[PDB]
Design a protein around this nucleic acid. Sequence first.
RNA 1: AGCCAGGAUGUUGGCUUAGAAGCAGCCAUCAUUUAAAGAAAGCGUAAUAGCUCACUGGUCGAGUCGGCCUGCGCGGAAGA
Lengths: 38, 176, 71
Amino acid sequence: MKVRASVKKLCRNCKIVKRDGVIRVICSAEPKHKQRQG
Amino acid sequence: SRVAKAPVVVPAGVDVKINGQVITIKGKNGELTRTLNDAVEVKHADNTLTFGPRDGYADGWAQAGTARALLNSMVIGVTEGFTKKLQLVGVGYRAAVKGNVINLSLGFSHPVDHQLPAGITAECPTQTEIVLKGADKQVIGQVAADLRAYRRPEPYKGKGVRYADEVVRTKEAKKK
Amino acid sequence: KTPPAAVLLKKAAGIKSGSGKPNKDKVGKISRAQLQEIAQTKAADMTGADIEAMTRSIEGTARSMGLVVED
RNA sequence: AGCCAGGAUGUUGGCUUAGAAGCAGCCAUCAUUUAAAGAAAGCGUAAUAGCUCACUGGUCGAGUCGGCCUGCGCGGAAGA
């Protein structure tokens, strides 16, 4: 798990959210699906 | 936001009074309440309401729908309240909450013994369910969620308090 | 009793599967006479005695199997 | 967008293992009822249940959306 500059693939259960202008990857069923950059 | 224009329709036991600044609320479950309209513009036609911006400001929707969502909860809060089930199913768990005090057996060094903020009342008529009484949707949720931080459910056993809906994503140990 | 038209076609055609590996495995061909032995499997559920009609469902079954209607 | 009824049928298409339960190889990609639902994308477990497309339809009802360029900011960003 890292902040990972590129967002490129998701699942339909992954919400994705924008905070302080930056995108974050987040999913209720997949604790590995975490990114903090974009 | 079409919901900010949706009528709300004030229910029984509630009374609303309106001005060009500040909205005034009375209700049989709440207390005399006023809200300042420092960023929003609100109208009330005897039993039905509408919200918007007081000057544009780009797109106009930034605060008015939030101020409306708050009002559309408040007019229920001040007459009948919100759902009041916070439940236990784990072994050796016991509810003993009373008045402003949270007493709870959850597998820790102390029975919580927490004193709560203002505007909130707690009871447990059964040892398996906590019942929260209040007219504010924010405090009734925030106290149950701040209580969620006391022994957070563990990744492979998932035991703790639930809001009458099971959500914990509890793991299974490696395969096998 | 008699089996379904599909396996009764595999008993008449040079097929061993399935069409298999192209240009290595085979399907053969079946004649109008060889079709009309299989069409008898319809002669008590179809109300008309027309042999052409009861063979149309076999020619359709042959396409559903890649089987060749060739003399 | 939300709320909500239907995601059906020929059919266990056929070969096959282990169940096949849409979610397993390879072969057939056609048909029907209708206002309307693919020989259906996908997840889910060893299997299930569950989640979830597709298409039509019920209610409010006026505007709404996804890319491809361009001026300018946003983060990307760690050193004595």
